[PDB]
Write a protein that binds this DNA or RNA. Structure first.
Ligand code: MG
Ligand code: MG
Ligand code: MG
Ligand code: MG
Ligand code: MG
Ligand code: MG
Ligand code: MG
Ligand code: MG
Ligand code: MG
Ligand code: MG
Ligand code: MG
Ligand code: MG
Ligand code: MG
Ligand code: MG
Ligand code: MG
Ligand code: MG
Ligand code: MG
Ligand code: MG
Ligand code: MG
Ligand code: MG
Ligand code: MG
Ligand code: MG
Ligand code: MG
Ligand code: MG
Ligand code: MG
Ligand code: MG
Ligand code: MG
Ligand code: MG
Ligand code: MG
Ligand code: MG
Ligand code: MG
Ligand code: MG
Ligand code: MG
Ligand code: MG
Ligand code: MG
Ligand code: MG
Ligand code: MG
Ligand code: MG
Ligand code: MG
Ligand code: MG
Ligand code: MG
Ligand code: MG
Ligand code: ZN
Lengths: 86, 122, 52, 25, 50, 134
RNA sequence: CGCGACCUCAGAUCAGACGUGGCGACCCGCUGAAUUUAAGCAUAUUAGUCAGCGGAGGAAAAGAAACUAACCAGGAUUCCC
RNA sequence: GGCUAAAUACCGGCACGAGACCGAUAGUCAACAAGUACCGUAAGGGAAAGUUGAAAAGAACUUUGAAGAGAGAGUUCAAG
RNA sequence: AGCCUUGAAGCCUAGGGCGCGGGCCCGGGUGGAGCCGCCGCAGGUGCAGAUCUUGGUGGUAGUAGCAAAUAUUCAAACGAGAACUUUGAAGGCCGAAGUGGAGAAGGGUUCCAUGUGAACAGCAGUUGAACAUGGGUCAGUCGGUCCUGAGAGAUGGGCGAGCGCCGUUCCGAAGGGACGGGCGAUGGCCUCCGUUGCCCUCAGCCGAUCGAAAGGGAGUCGGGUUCAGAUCCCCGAAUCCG
RNA sequence: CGACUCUUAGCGGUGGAUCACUCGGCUCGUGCGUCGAUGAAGAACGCAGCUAGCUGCGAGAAUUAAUGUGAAUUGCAGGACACAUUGAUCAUCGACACUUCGAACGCACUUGCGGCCCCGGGUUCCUCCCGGGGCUACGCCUGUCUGAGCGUCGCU
């Protein structure tokens, strides 16, 4: 009865959504993420999975602030000035 | 009667707050119109009124920051948001004065033994 | 919250509110069932707002 | 007239937020 | 279930709104290629997993 | 021959920068030669086509001496619509046919402050070049 | 008993600062296999390599001899032949 | 005990140039709403999928049928 | 000074031929924009196989089959269309450990109204949990929320190359509190009472925090109401806590 | 005869090979070589008149301001007393802004509980209630203040 019959007894969730990486790998009883390692301060990451590192590296997301830096670097991070008014 | 930022530059704060409130009242009416069957003209006005709201808030925020910078110009300590952003690493650099500093031992060496200009005959 | 909704309704439309009931809809929006004081006619107030 | 028109230093203390004013006084 | 967390009831609401057909004026757009919403979901055929 | 190290003659790159050009670049791409009379009068060869210009079609099914007004510059499709350069659909409704600006000739120019400024600049740079050789 | 110095050590949402996390192609410090070759296999090899941990910068590290030599002597470090 | 540029390294990043390379089962997994859809409790695994036409001119109208579908007609150099 | 919109590549051909052969040439058709000869150079360069890879198609074959749980029949309506939908009437079954009425976990809109009958529902469908367009979940009193349970888990400390780990009162100056009293500073229904700062005095809890929608845990019941919600809305009558 | 079967050819299907195309790859080279508590990378949820995905953005939400440009954007509609010094659109980008989580910071991670200060509305000073704003994390350096010690002392 280890097959079809035993598949009907599973109605208790092991993982839920992680508040750091948003992946359903937050083990509830261990209070840890199998994906990002939350609540550890440092992000979980290994070199034996290159594919996994390119799934969530820098660039794969929004780059909300890093992509304005790339624009600001091309002008020397000038601040407190404006183009000559009309 | 469109709202242009240039027209708003010199006005008082409370005068712009009043102007802001009129637009916000207008937008709410349009949002009621959006669900009661307002004409296409009223629907198109929503985006016009929304950006007019942004323009006023922009001029209020800009004018307020301009005066805060004038307020804190001579002050030694300024709010973190009035200090230069640059990058985090650039904020931690030795400033202009600190990089120019030299030990008196190095100043005397440069005075006595300055690199010279010379040529060698072919 | 209910206190905020009640105070906003009164200021926006200058009416009095008896109580507020609230639910969050399955699509994520929050619906507020605002009941007005007996000296107010929601049918009349709706015409002022433009609902009817 | 319409056809004519359509063809062409210091701190302002009132813009300072109240909280800053309270702190200094 | 009836017993729900706010976070789950909000995730489910977003999955509800994405489950609609494309507007028909999207077809006439100049460089359009989309023929239909290829990301449709059915509560019975495929499960949200959370 | 091209010598600038920072200009690409790569075919894939050039085409991409044509079909992804932003609107204010498509304007320059969408330029038309001026009629012989206009070229002599202003010393200019080409202008970016504009609404309310009057043009002659010189290539394609609609070529001919008829002069029509430019009624729409559909920069997204890289075509302009002209008066009377049109056909009928199945149901009989008339529809404009898109002509590329490089296949027409500008016979009259819609002139305003900016258009006169643009014409002057082109005539001035030409004169500097003509005297540079001389 | 009290008062006062110093020393050692505490508490502050005290004034003003600074570290944390990421990326990690290249760089520095550790730790570190076994497939494999040896026609077997244990030293050996694989290899100070993969994996694992830490720390950076536009480069890093190194660097002005407790050096090489044994010549009629050379003269910091790094890289190429 | 200590500092020190240069010549050196760079399959990540920003911005470029090129090629005796491949040409949609190739070339990156990904020429396209691709690290997407989908699978797994999870760590992870992970595709398929390019081409009307010069121009939508994308077939009005008549007729049989409940309709899908047809027969005529029409657009186009061509709907062979 | 090659061929090509007066038609390239490709593809088809009971057309004419060439070569021992690998192959090639010409005719005809389709196609619609590129291509080939010669001298050299270069190679991801030649398929019948690998239970080869990926994609497609056969015969088997209109075949196996659409047989677990007793069962349907008559009349009418809508409709192009009815064994299967709806209504009425018969004949049956589940037979209160139910094929009844409600929940937990899980699902996540499947719920409700209207429309469609393309695809799906292994016959059909006028029907559906399918598709389409719009709606629907209302609380002091019902749960969470709080408590602690087995347990998990910081700090001090120890260990550790290090990410860190051990450990939960054990190597800790672990209390930011209180009736009262005393000094000032302020206030207000300035009268006299508050508030505040400091001082005096007093002080075990001895373990941060997390841990149950079945354990502990104050307090809501009756009637009506919707297409879909109600101990939540309305009517009536109460109650707990602050 | 005629079915059925086999072969060949025409035509029609099924299928998507081949050829031609290429806004994609790959490889080499060059210049630069820049994240974050002033809150990064990443994630969540929102934002369009009609908008599901992609894209862009953050309650000022397919963007504000400024500068350059100079008449569009466009699938449909619309035109704000929108559009030519009353500047469409695009581009640039220095001004302003930038929801929730996240090193993630009041404590916890259910949108649960607080504490301090200030402001406003309830009534009516204080209280009380509601709302708004600002603070409240660990380590660490310099300095400040408040302390402790049968630590070493000095005068009482
Ligand atoms: Mg478990
Ligand atoms: Mg000295
Ligand atoms: Mg299922
Ligand atoms: Mg401080
Ligand atoms: Mg061996
Ligand atoms: Mg062997
Ligand atoms: Mg062996
Ligand atoms: Mg070794
Ligand atoms: Mg390694
Ligand atoms: Mg590391
Ligand atoms: Mg670091
Ligand atoms: Mg750096
Ligand atoms: Mg040397
Ligand atoms: Mg050194
Ligand atoms: Mg393909
Ligand atoms: Mg491929
Ligand atoms: Mg293929
Ligand atoms: Mg091929
Ligand atoms: Mg493929
Ligand atoms: Mg093909
Ligand atoms: Mg074509
Ligand atoms: Mg043809
Ligand atoms: Mg044959
Ligand atoms: Mg073609
Ligand atoms: Mg090759
Ligand atoms: Mg084969
Ligand atoms: Mg049979
Ligand atoms: Mg059966
Ligand atoms: Mg039941
Ligand atoms: Mg039921
Ligand atoms: Mg069927
Ligand atoms: Mg139903
Ligand atoms: Mg522990
Ligand atoms: Mg608890
Ligand atoms: Mg409980
Ligand atoms: Mg209970
Ligand atoms: Mg009640
Ligand atoms: Mg045949
Ligand atoms: Mg939307
Ligand atoms: Mg602007
Ligand atoms: Mg402009
Ligand atoms: Mg709980
Ligand atoms: Zn995580």
């Amino acid at each position: 009865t280890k097959g079809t019959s035993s598949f009907g007894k599973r109605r208790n969730k092991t993982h839920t959504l992680c508040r750091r990486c948003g992946s359903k790998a937050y083990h509830l009883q261990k209070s840890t993420c199998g994906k990002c390692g939350y609540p550890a301060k440092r992000k979980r990451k290994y070199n034996w999975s290159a594919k996994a590192k390119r799934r969530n590296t820098t660039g794969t997301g929004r780059m909300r602030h890093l992509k304005i830096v790339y624009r600001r670097f091309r002008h020397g991070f000038r601040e407190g000035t404006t183009p000559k008014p009309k | 009667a469109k709202i242009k930022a240039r027209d708003l530059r010199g006005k008082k704060k409370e005068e712009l707050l009043k102007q802001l409130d009129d637009l916000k009242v207008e937008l709410s009416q349009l949002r009621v119109a959006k669900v009661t069957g307002g004409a296409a003209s009223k629907l198109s006005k929503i985006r016009v009124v929304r950006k007019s709201i942004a323009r006023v808030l922009t001029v209020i925020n800009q004018t307020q920051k301009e005066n805060l910078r004038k307020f804190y110009k001579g002050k030694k300590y300024k709010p973190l948001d009035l200090r230069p952003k640059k990058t985090r690493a650039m904020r931690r650099r030795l400033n202009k004065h600190e990089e120019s500093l030299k030990t008196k031992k190095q100043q005397r060496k440069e005075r006595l033994y300055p690199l010279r200009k010379y040529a060698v005959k072919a | 919250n209910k206190h905020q909704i009640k105070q906003a309704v009164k200021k926006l439309y200058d009416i009095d509110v008896a109580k507020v009931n609230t639910l969050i809809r399955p699509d994520g929006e929050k619906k507020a069932y605002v009941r007005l004081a007996p000296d107010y006619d929601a049918l009349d107030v709706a015409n002022k707002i433009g609902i009817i | 007239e319409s056809r004519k028109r359509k063809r062409p230093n210091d701190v302002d203390m009132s813009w300072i937020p109240q909280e800053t004013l309270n702190q200094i006084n | 279930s009836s017993h729900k967390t706010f976070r789950i009831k909000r995730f489910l609401a977003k999955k509800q709104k994405q489950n609609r057909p494309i507007p028909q004026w999207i077809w006439m757009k100049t460089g359009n290629k989309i023929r239909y919403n290829s990301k449709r979901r059915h509560w019975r055929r495929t499960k949200l997993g959370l | 021959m091209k010598f600038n190290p920072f200009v690409t003659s790569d075919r894939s790159k050039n085409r991409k920068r044509h079909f992804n050009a932003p609107s204010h670049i498509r304007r320059k791409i969408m330029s038309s030669p001026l009629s012989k009379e206009l070229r002599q009068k202003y010393n200019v060869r080409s202008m970016p086509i504009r609404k309310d210009d009057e043009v002659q079609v010189v290539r394609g099914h609609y070529k001919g001496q008829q002069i029509g007004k430019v009624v729409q510059v559909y920069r997204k499709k890289y075509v302009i619509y002209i008066e009377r350069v049109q056909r009928e659909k199945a149901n009989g409704t008339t529809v404009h046919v898109g002509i590329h600006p490089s296949k027409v000739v500008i016979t009259r120019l819609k002139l305003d402050k900016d258009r006169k400024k643009i014409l002057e600049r082109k005539a001035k740079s030409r004169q500097v070049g003509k005297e540079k050789g001389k």
